[PDB]
Structures are given as C-alpha cells and as structure tokens.
Amino acid sequence: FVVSPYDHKYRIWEAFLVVLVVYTAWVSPFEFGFLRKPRPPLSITDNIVNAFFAIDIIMTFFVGYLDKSTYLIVDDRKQIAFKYLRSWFLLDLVSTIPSEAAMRISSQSYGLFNMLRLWRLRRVGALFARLEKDRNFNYFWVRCAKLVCVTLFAVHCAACFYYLIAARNSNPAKTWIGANVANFLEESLWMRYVTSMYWSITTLTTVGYGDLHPVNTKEMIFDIFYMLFNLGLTAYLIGNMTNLVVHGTSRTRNFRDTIQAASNFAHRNHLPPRLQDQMLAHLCLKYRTDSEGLQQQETLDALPKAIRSSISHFLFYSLMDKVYLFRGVSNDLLFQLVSEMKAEYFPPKEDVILQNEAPTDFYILVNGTADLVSIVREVKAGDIIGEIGVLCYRPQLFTVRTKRLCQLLRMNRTTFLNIIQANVGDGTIIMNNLLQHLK
Amino acid sequence: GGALLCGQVQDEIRFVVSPYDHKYRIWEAFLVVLVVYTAWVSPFEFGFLRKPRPPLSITDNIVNAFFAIDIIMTFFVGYLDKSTYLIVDDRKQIAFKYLRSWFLLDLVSTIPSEAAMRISSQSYGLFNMLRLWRLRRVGALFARLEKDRNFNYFWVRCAKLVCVTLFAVHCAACFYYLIAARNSNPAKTWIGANVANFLEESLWMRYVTSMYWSITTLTTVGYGDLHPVNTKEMIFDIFYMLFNLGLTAYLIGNMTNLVVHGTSRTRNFRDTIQAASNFAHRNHLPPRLQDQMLAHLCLKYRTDSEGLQQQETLDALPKAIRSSISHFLFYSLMDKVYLFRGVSNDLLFQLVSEMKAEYFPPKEDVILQNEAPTDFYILVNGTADLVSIVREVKAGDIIGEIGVLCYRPQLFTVRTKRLCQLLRMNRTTFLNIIQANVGDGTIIMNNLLQ
Amino acid sequence: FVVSPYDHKYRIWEAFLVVLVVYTAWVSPFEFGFLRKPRPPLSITDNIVNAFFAIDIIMTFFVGYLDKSTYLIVDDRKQIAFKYLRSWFLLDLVSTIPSEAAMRISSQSYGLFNMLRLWRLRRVGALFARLEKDRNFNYFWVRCAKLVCVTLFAVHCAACFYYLIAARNSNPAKTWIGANVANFLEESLWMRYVTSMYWSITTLTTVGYGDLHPVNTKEMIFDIFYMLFNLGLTAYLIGNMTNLVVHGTSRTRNFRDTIQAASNFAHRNHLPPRLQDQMLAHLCLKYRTDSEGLQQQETLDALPKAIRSSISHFLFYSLMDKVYLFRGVSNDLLFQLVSEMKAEYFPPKEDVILQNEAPTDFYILVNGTADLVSIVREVKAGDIIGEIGVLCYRPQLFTVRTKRLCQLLRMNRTTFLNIIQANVGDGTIIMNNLLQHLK
Amino acid sequence: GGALLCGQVQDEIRFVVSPYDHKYRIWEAFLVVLVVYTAWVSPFEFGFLRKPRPPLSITDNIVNAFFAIDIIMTFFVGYLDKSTYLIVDDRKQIAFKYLRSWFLLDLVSTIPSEAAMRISSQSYGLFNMLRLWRLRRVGALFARLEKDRNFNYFWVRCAKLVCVTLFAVHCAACFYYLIAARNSNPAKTWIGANVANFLEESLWMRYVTSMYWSITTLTTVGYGDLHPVNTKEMIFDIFYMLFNLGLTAYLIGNMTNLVVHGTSRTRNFRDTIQAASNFAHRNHLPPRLQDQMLAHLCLKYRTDSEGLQQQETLDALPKAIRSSISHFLFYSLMDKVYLFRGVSNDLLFQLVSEMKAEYFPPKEDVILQNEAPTDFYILVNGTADLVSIVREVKAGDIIGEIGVLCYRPQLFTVRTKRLCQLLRMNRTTFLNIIQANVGDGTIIMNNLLQ
C-alpha cells in the first residue's frame, strides 16, 4: 500500500503536476479577466487538468510522510489519511470541481470560481523548498528563479485585473484602453492581452511612458495599490540580487587578499626575488587546486577520525601496496602509516628536498614524476623518496626535483620514530625490507 | 540516506503606577491607534478643509479628550533613572521631570481647534499640524519592539518602512493639493489643467487624484498626466523628488541588510557541506561511503554550534551567576545511572567538565564488539540497542564503560534506531580523571563490580 | 614666519574659503549657462571672492606641511615654496584673474573662463578627507554628506548646460524649453532657472514626466550622456546608503543574537526559570552599560600594560585611599592590588556572594550600595566585602545583596595569595590592619 | 598629538610560440580592439543597412584579414594542460585541440560578407551577426584581469559593467529600428509617428534617435515621446523591459558589493578607535593621558595586522619553502649588532623566534633609568637618543640588554624622535632562552663584558 516520499516514481508525478500548476497560474487570471463563459478548447483542457488533480486527491492517500518530530517516515494508513483530511483536503477538493458544474449553482460563478484554482500554487512553493535544500543546485540561483516566477506572475495578474476594470465599465471611453483604441471590444484577444501586458510591465519597471494610464477613480485606486506593491517587490529583488552577487564573487576576492598578504609580507621582510616567486607560485597553485587538494584537506581536517581513517584506507592503501620497503609488514602498522601521512601538491621544477639537508621528513609520490639530481634517476608514480635519510639520520643523498604538477604524501621523522616505537617487532620487517632494498 | 538529516540541520540553522503595569501598557497601545488617526487627519485638515465641521470636529475633540486624560495620568506614573535602575515614585520628581520635558508640547497638542480658532480664523489647519507632535509615541513603540525578543525583527522593520513611506505619500498629496486650492486661478494648477472645475468635484475624487499623483511620483513611474504647471508647483516637486531619492535609497538599503542578515548562517553551513560534496565528487568516492561522511559532517556542525553558544553565554557573565549556572550544570548533566551513585564532588566535576557531547545518526553503530576499550558514553536522548539484539538502551543509560574502568575488550556492538545524543569520555582522559582522589574511583569500581 | 597646519587660526581660514568654494560652485555654471557678460551685483561679488583667494595665493607661502615620508612637519621656507610652485600654484593663480581682464583678451571669454574657477573644488575634497579621519564625526554620515553634495552639484550643472544648448539655438522653437513656452527669452531669469532645475531633477530621479524633453539631436546627445551618468551615480548612492544602514543597525542585531544564544542555552539545558531570568537580566544590563563597563573593558583588555596600569592608578587609587584595611601599606603592594583588580557591574537586588559560600573572591564597591543579609548592616561607596573570608579561608559570614545598579572591583583568592607572597613584610601591615578592624 | 598617527594608520589601512610571449600578448590585445569594432558594427549592419558599401565593407574585410591571420597563427601556439601544468608543444596536439574546440566557429566568423551574399541576398545582416562570436575574447580578457594583482579590481569590475550596459543599449537600439524599417507602413511605427518621413533623414539622426529611445527606456526615465505604436513593438519592448529589470538589479548588486568590500578594513579599525574614544570621553580622562593611550592602541593594531599576514602566508605553504622562508627570516632578522657575533644557531633560533616586534610613537620613552631590567630591545627602524643626551641610537642598534644578561638596573632613559619599530625580549623568556646550551650564552656574556 503506502508509497514512500523520495520514491523516484512519485517525484516524477509531483514534477508533472507542477507543470500543470504553471498552466493553472496562467489560465486562471486570464479566464477571470478576459473570458465570460466556458469555451473550447480551454474548457476541455481545463477538465483534463482537473482529472489529473482528481487522481492526485486519491493518490495522496497511500503516501507516507516524514514525521520530523521523530525523524522517521510514517507508513500508517490511519495516520496519513487523518493528517491529509486535516491538512487541506477540502481546499484541494473544491479546486477540482468542473467549471460547468460550479456554474450551474450560479451563472456568474465562472471567473471567480476558476480563481480558486490558484490554491494549487502551494506545490510550486514546496518545489522551491526542496531545491533550496538539495546540494545539486546553487541556492542563490534557485532564489533567483523563485523571484523571476513571482515577477512574471505579478505582471500577468495585474494585466488581467486592470483589463477587467476596463471591460466591466459602463462606457468604453473613459477607460485606460478605450481612451487610446476607438473600440477595443471587437478587436483581437491577442491584441487586448498584449496591450494589457505592455501597460503592466511598463508600470512595474516604472518606465511609465504614459500612453496608457488611469482615466477614472477605480483605475487610480487599483494603480495606487499596484505601484505600492511594485516598490516592495523591486526592493526585495535588489536585496536578493545583491546577496547573489556578493556570495558568487567571493572566491576572487579571497584569492586577491591572500596574494596581497603574501606580497606585503615579502615587501616588509625584503625576501629575495627567487623565493618570493616560489611563494606566490605555490599560493596560485593552491587556488587552482580547488577541486582536489583544497576541498580535500578542507574536508579531511573536519571529519571524525574513524571515517577519516576509512577514507585514507580507500584512497591510498592501494598506493601502499606498491612500496617494496613495506612489503609483508603488519597490516596495522601500514594503516597507521596512512593515518599519519599528510598530502601536498607541488609545481613543476621545484625541490621537495635538497641534497645534504637534514632528514626531517620523507614522501611517497602519488602521481607526477621527479628527478634525483647532475641527474641520476627518475622517480615514478607509486615510488618513495627520502626514507633512507630518515632511517640513517644523516643528510639526504640527492635533491629531488619535480617535473610535473606532483602530489606527494608526507611524514615527519619525529612521528615516524613514535610509529616505530609502536609495532616494534614488525619494525623488524621494516629493517629487513630496507636492508634488501639496500642490497 | 543523509539528505534528510542535513535538511533537518539546515532547518535548525502611595499612588504611583509602574510603567510596566499591563493596564498601563494597554492604555499606551490604545493611544498609538489615536496617533495613527492623528497622522491621517492632521494633513488632511491642513490640505483639504478650511473650518471645523462634523464628523471630523467631534471625533477630534473625543481624541483630544483621551490625550488630556493622559496629560493628567502621566503625573501618577513612575520612571526608572539610569543612575540607579530603581523606579522613582517621588511625586515631586515625577512632576518635575514631566514639566521639564514634554508637558508644554503635550498641552498645546491638545487644545480644541474650535478654541484656537477664536485667536484667529486663519489658524485652523496650521494649528492642526501641531498635533503631529504625537508621532513620538510611534517612534517609541518601534524602539521597544526592535529590541524585544518576542517580536520578529524582519516584520518590525518592514512595518517601520511601510509607515514611513505611507506617511510621506499622504503628506505630499495634501501639501500639493493645498498649492492648487490656494492659487488665484484654478485652471493654471496641476489639477485644474486636467479637471476643469475640480473645486466642484467630491472630496474623495480630489483626495484619490492627489494620492495617485503622489504615489506616481514617489515610485518614479511618472506618467505625466498630472505634473507641475507653475513655478510654485515646480519648487515643491523639486524638493519632493530629492526627498524621494533619499527615501528610495534607504528602503533598498534596509531590504539588502535584512536579506544578508537572514541568509548568513545558512550560507555558512552550505559552504562546509558543498566543500565535502565537491571533494567526494572529484575523488569519485562510493555513494555508500559518501553519505556516511556527509551525515557525520552535518552532526559535527550541529554539535559545535551549541558549544559556541554555551561558551559565549557563560564567559560574558559575572562570576556569581556564572558559578550558579556551572554548578547547576555539573550537578544535573551527570548522575544519569546508578553506576555513579555516591560519586564524590571533585570526581564529579573532573568527569562532567571533561565529557564531550556529540550527536550520532539513526541506524548506525557507536561501538563494536571485541574492540579495545578506548571510549565509553552516556546516552542523553534518542534510542539504541545492544546487539542479534540482547536489549534496548534507554535515554539516561550507558555503553562501554564496563570495559574501561576494568580493562576488557567491549562485550557488545551497539546500534542507534533514532537520532541520538551522547556524552563521550576517552579512556586516556578517564584515567587522568580517576587518578584524582583515587579512593572515590575505587567506589565507582565497586559500583560496577558484581 | 611659517604657520603650522593644525593651527586653529588657520583651520578657521580654510573653513571660510570652503564657503567661498560653495559660492563658486553655484555661480560658475550659472554664469556659464544664463549670463552673457559681467553685470552687477555678481561682478563686484566675484571680484571680492577673487580677492580672498588672491590673499590665499600669498598666505599659502609661509605654511608648513606634514611630510608623511618622515612623519614630521616641514618648516623650511625654501621647501614649502618649492613644493607649492610645483603643486598647482599656476592653476590657483589663473583661477583668480578678474573676468573683466580675462575678457579683454577676448570678449567671448567670460563664461568659459569663469568655468575654470571650479578648480577651487579641490578644497571641498580636502575637507571631506579630513572629516573622514576625525573621530568626532560619523564616517558613513560624512560619506552621506559627500554624496548629497555631488548630487546637488550634478543637478545644477546639467540644468545650466541644457539651458545653454537651448539659448544658443538659431530658433527658440525646436528647443526643449521653447516647445512649451511661447517665448522663454523675455521671461524672468528665476522662471528659466526653476524650469531647468525642474527638468534636471525630473530626469536624474528618472521620474521623467515628459513635459520637458529633447526636441533635437544636440539635446538628445546631451541627455544620452546625462542619463548614463545618472545610472552610475544612483547605483553608487544605493551602495553607500546600504553600507550606512548595515553598519548603523549592527548593535541591535548583535544584542538580539546574544539574547537568542542565551535563551537557546537555557532551553537546551533546561535551566530553572529564576536563574534564567538572572542570566538575561545581566546580559541586558551589559548592553545598556555600553558607555561605561562595556567600552571600558573592551578597551582596557587591549592596552599595553604600562598605560593600562597608569589608567588604573588614575581611576581607582583614590578609592583605595578609602579602605582602612590597607591603611599605611607599602605603595607598591596597593598598586599591584589595583593592577590585579577586575571591574564588574550588577543589577539591583542580586547576590554578589551568599553566606556559607567558599571564599574564592572579594570585592570593593566603587558606587552603589548593598545590604549584608535578616538584614544586619549597609555597605557604602568606597567600602569592602568578603575580605575576612579570604583572610580566614572559611565560609563567608553574610550574603551581600545589591540595592542599586552597583559597580564592584573584584579579586580571586588564588591570585591574592600570590600577591601576599610578594611584599611579604608589608603583609604584616595587611595582618595588623585587619586585626585592628577585627578589634 | 595622536590624531595624525592614527590618521596615518588609517591611510595604511621547434616552431611553437608560448602563450606567455610578450609579442603574442600584444597581438591578442590588438585583436580585442577589433572585437570592440565588431561589437559596434555588426548590430548596426543588421539594423540599419541592407547591402555592403564603402567604407564599412573594406574596413570589415581588413578586420577579417587580421582574424584569418589568427586562425592560422593559433596552430603554432602552445597551451598548458591542467594535468601536468607543462606547456604542450606537440604540433599534432595543438592542432587537434584547436580543431576539436573553436576552429569552425572562428572560420565562419571570418568569411567575407561579399562572398556569403552570393549564397543568398537576404543573408547579409544576419550573417554579420555571427561575427559577435568574437566577444569570447573580451570575456577572456576580463577573466584574466580580475585575478591579476597588477590591476585594481574596482576599476576592472566597473569597466565590465560599462561594457555590458553599453552593448545592451546599442543592440536594443538597432533591433528596435529594424522593427520600424521593416514595417509595411512607416507611419504606424514608433519613429514614423514622430518623424513623418524618417527614411529620408540622415543615418546619424536615425541612430541618435534610436539610442535616445534605448537609453531613455533602460534608465527607466521613459519620457514617452517615443514608445511602441504596434503589437510587434510592444512584444519587443516587453522583453527589453524585463531584461533591463534584471540588469539594473545586477548593477546595483555589484556596486553594493564593491563599496562594502572596499570599506571593510577601515570599518574594523574605526570600531576599536571609537570604543577607546567613547571610554576616554565617558570616564572623563585627561586629554594629556587620552592621546597617549590612543597612540598606543593605533600602533598595536598596526603590529598585529602584520602578524596575522605573516601567519596566514606561512601556515598555508608546503614544508619545503616554508622551511626556506623561515630559515632566511631567522638568519636575517637577527645579528643586528656585534653583541651577537658568534651566536650559535640554536641560541639564534631560540632568540629570534621568541622576540616580539612592535611599533612605538615619536617623542616618547621606551625604557627609563634606574628601573629594573625587565626587558630589552633591538631597533629595527626609526631613531632615538640615549638620555640630557649622551648619544644617538641608530637603526640596527640595541637598548637595555646590558642590564639584562648581567643583572643591573638600567643605565639610561631612551627617547624616540621618529616613529620607531623595535623587537622586544622579556628577561623571563630571555633566561629560558639562555638556559638552552648555556655555554653559548656565556659567549654572549663575553661579548658584552669589557
């Protein structure tokens, strides 16, 4: 029986009903403003759309709900039906009665009863509430789409109401439209619609050419309220667009402040130009490494250590399988290794470590390649550097120079000593499998 | 999973009367309605009318009577002085402060216009304009509401903006009509150039036409059907247009302030979640792993949000009540199970000040069987099972400590079945805690040992 | 000889010349747009103003300048004259030649030569630069005054240029003004001015009634550029007004976030309602204590310890003179006392400490009064509480209850013990002068 | 004093060519000028002209020739791949990437219109509109300038806004004229309703009239002299007015962003200074004392600003060059006087890593005679005297250490005579530093002892 929310076969039905809501949002004000009585084709199409919402009146029984008081999805048919009968079953139901039936109770009913069908706009508000949570869509741009919809619906409604004020008048002259057009009745419905839409947008944007304007007090009262609504709407629009701009441009501002800080530091302390250019080159690479190294380390430093470890195991243990200088070591020691290892990125043609430097650290190349340097040999992907210096505790035997954008795992001798004070018997495998690379 | 949990986290992200008396605040709230009345009627009497007439005269005298009652009653209402923060109830001091401030303006704002018009017949409208002194009461009300936690700041500010713009529209409409009505020739006026005999038309039509012009100008729609015809009208409209420029910039500044204010914390959350999303996408992590890390990241954000609020609300606060608060917290957050019964106050403080609160997702496992006893927990709220199941775990219940204080690998796995809050303690810090006054630690061991 | 900048007698002269700049800013575009040849009174008044600026051409010799490369004011007559002759002496000089003399070189010179006098606006920009630094004036509101000036000057200039475009035309009809007015020449100069000012503001505010608008291509080109300038100006105005609003309202937002944080903390941990009301009462008092306790402690915690000490000596040593329980102690020990003392504020009817509490701290009342409590005695201004408990190290003998908004200095026993391990022989005066209050 | 110091602080607050070759960047910068030409001419040929004519045809063929040269030359220009950050110089890879991306669009954007018009005579204006593909080069230029430290971000953004709004105005003017010129009756058009025979008027007059309408509409001034007369013009203007609403909101959003961005750090300074100002005012501090504390507060703000920049620029940076930077700093910030000559590397590091930099006002005293030797300093820059005077103190000079390493009350007062920067060391931390490898500390004592 009870269908889950978040069922994909249900999500496509709700998305379909939203396009029938967009149809309703256009048709209902137009039928209110421009039409007197039901006519083909619009009558049969509206009855078709009412059939789809009448199906939904039933199919919203048998659908569960997330009770956020307990964070579980309720599947009890007695509870879901009781909740729906309380939650606006009657408004949905009345919004689906045919206009023919709803006007046998009174012939004047047509336009104003069809305006009740704007109740369906609750579904558009619900869709925006979903998209403002779903991380697959940008939040500020979904707010933009929401504000575009509100604007277009306002322009359409105002056009239909203001035409109705003219069309109901006892004289076609002395109306805003009949003041310009000799007889706007007995003129094409498209031309009357476009003329009203033109007036409406001309007013909402405050261009106000003044070819079309209020001629009588009823028109003036309507336009007074429409102009006051437009002042609030535009101030809201400019607020939201400012927020969209301010947060969208933030990356470039932060990058420039970072480079400005480094440049000022170099100019205060009078760093040598070579090393200054290396500092800026690494900061630029960090900004261009957003999708990898940046959002990697900006995530991993937050995670609880259990899942953090499981990530490191997924991501790098297959690299630890490549290094002969750990072959057959105890599994826990190699897990500890990847749990301690930092990860870093280097530009091309940079020294990671120089010859005759003290062995404070060692590295494993994840990807990219480097030269020991004059040149003696090449370092592959899945290959290790500096470790014999960390073992020996004597100065490093060669400079290692990047020749690609290169990713390296890193460890420090002070913690490697501590790691070797763990697993002390497995340290014999460390020793032997170094000695057999040393042979 | 995951999505609905982070959605929830985003959703969470002798005769003196006191001025605080409810009966007095109902009276003050009533008088603000008569201020809104005054704000409409005084410009209208200045613009459109030349002598007092029914119903407006009798209604104004009724309103003046309510304000005259207030002129009396405010001699019997105390005030608080910023030197002492006590309410002053000395009749002489209440009288002196009222006389020295606002009594005279309140008095002239209350004299009947039918009396003032015996001083001169030209006085009527311009004397009515003095009643706008009463607007101080609306400014006072908004100042209270803006700093009151019961009221939504967004809607209080919006109400302020709406009142300012409506009052500006109304005043400009009345002044611009007065410039037309007081002219020597009606046909050379902004209104008589359109309506050939406007002085014969209904007062409603003239008002609506003036409001229409005023709003058309302030919104800058400016259809141009109605516009300045003569030099007086041009000078007036020059200053009105300048004012409207400043007012529009103020309205947009306030709406921008409101939307960046209200969005800020949701933005701060989104950045962390979308960073983790981009990481998981780019490194091609399995979906089965991804939603576990997104769930934990959302619940860490929830945890430290509450921690910062506790810190910033305690470390601001004088040592006396900071003591009382931290005392109550220590003596009420702990003691959640009989294993602690008889714990000494020092051992209590050392434990409860070091335990770390955290939130844990539904349908997940907090500790695992036969693992080393690195940590133990107290369940604050939510529900879990010891696990096949052996029993349910309640709120006000514990896991893992039976392996920690006497060293054993953990006897059970434990699995959540609602969103759950726990207090963690790690064995290394627990050992340091138990090393304080060790005898009491032995009494806890006796509570466990059976 | 050389007069200093920041001499008050010079600052009043520069402020006077700024009002003559405001005169120039109105008169020069008006003479350019509306007048053909020099006429009384405006000719004699302009010659008077030129005399004041000609005095300044001389009096700007003999005035020093702050050389911000070395942060000293230069007094060398050879340097100040050399700097001035380089720095725009010639533009100031040409801006003071009389219009009569400057039009004997050519009769058409009058209007366009008088436009050169807008060079004097450099002085208004300099005044705003000063006021944007002087802490006696609000920064955002000085930016507002700057933007009002720019707006009013733009409206005036545009009105004068657009009238000149009409007045130079070969036909009065086919001009924006002669299209409405049958003959605008031979009409009052005030009416022509007001008509132009009206058109100008109607356009800059974008109301655009359209009674007055460009009739010919020269007018259209001018209005094209004016409308493009106004779009930038209004967007700048709205930016600056937003910044003014955002920073001006910040106090209320921070207060509400503080109270919301405390309210949520109480609702999470389920604090008892009495103590919850005390917590909010103290946070409210802190916000209302902005000018004293807040900006006091928000300043003192920053200051370098030497000046911080000198402040404490100025502010509270005269209170330390009142306490008999330190009479005749070594001066250094009492300075150490005031250097250690914190300062705090309490609402009326609050316990600072209760009876039978442990003696962790003691206090001295700066102002306000309190009861020992049932009641036994009253505590004055310049009076001490809790110290016998800190001496005895046994629970406090009475509750002390505020009966005003009260300010107290505070110390903690752990640091008072350390302070008594300093000055150990002067501790004998502490002991004896307690024992003689204990008698 | 004081005021000018805080004012200063506020003022401070085989055949491949590389794409980085200066000769190539001059060529690319030249082609952007021909893009601005194309952006004007293509809408104008679409709106106002029906067949190619001098001078415009010959000028367009000259511009097409420069782009055809670029279509060739871009086969000889390398690119950098984001996988390796090396420049690719393989001729086959350069060719393939260019063919696989933009060669075809660059080619059709270069065919002479006098050739395309042999395919059909109606093609002319609509084929010219395809040349607007070239605008990608302007978008690329702005993307470079926005992230380039040599260029002011404010003016680069303003230039972007000005170009977008000018191009929108121009395009709308040309399209709206085309709607009029292509109508069956000129008198029923937005322009022919005003100018009875506009097709006889000069091309300049028609262009200026169309630009005037376009700007009047986009700025929303809307005089209404020129407006839509027929249904086609109304539909066009409906969509133009909607677009202008979005564009205006974007312009105001960018200007707000720019002014809050540029003001932020001055705001952050002002708050600290005005807090201290309000404190000194309310507590009635003497002016003689006040300006001393305001001076020190301004120079502390200056000091810690530079400290945060050093931290955030070092702790971001890989350990190799972080080492090189900190190494150079340690070996160059110290050794400022002969008292340190022969200092050991460990004692050097322990000292220089712990010394604290600070700024000190003019005409003030850093240490006083016969006071206890609590601290000593190295002068980094500025000037002072030992004090009556006994001698000047240089940059690269020291004060007070002669009382610290051998314990004595300080021999002199010392007084600044310019704004001065010093490195402090406190005797307690100095003792801890000297307790590392004490023999080297004795060699420093031998350097002082004579």
Ligand SMILES: CCCCCCCCCCCCCCCCCCCC(=O)O[C@H](COC(=O)CCCCCCCCCCCCCC)COP(=O)(O)OCCN
């Ligand atoms: C920098 C850009 C510069 C742009 C260019 C300018 C060019 C020169 C021209 C300058 C023109 C400037 C004109 C003024 C601009 C608008 C100023 C609005 C000020 C304002 O609203 O103040 C608030 C009024 O609050 C209140 O409490 C008011 C209460 C009013 C109650 C009225 C009740 C009316 C009822 C009847 C209505 C009429 C009948 C309708 C049918 C005060 O508070 P605050 O905002 O400062 O907040 C507290 C701080 N955060």
Ligand SMILES: CCCCCCCCCCCCCCCCCCCC(=O)O[C@H](COC(=O)CCCCCCCCCCCCCC)COP(=O)(O)OCCN
């Ligand atoms: C939320 C509020 C919603 C309001 C209500 C809306 C109601 C519905 C209607 C919606 C209408 C929306 C219409 C679009 C709005 C404006 C969009 C502007 C977008 C834009 O400018 O993008 C920039 C163009 O940059 C460029 O690089 C462009 C370069 C162009 C060069 C042109 C050269 C022209 C030379 C010739 C001129 C003509 C002759 C003049 C005599 C891209 O960059 P970015 O800003 O994103 O920056 C990078 C991120 N930070």
Ligand SMILES: [K+]
């Ligand atoms: K307008």
Ligand SMILES: [K+]
């Ligand atoms: K108009």
Ligand SMILES: [K+]
């Ligand atoms: K018009």
Ligand SMILES: [K+]
């Ligand atoms: K407008």
Ligand SMILES: [K+]
């Ligand atoms: K208009």
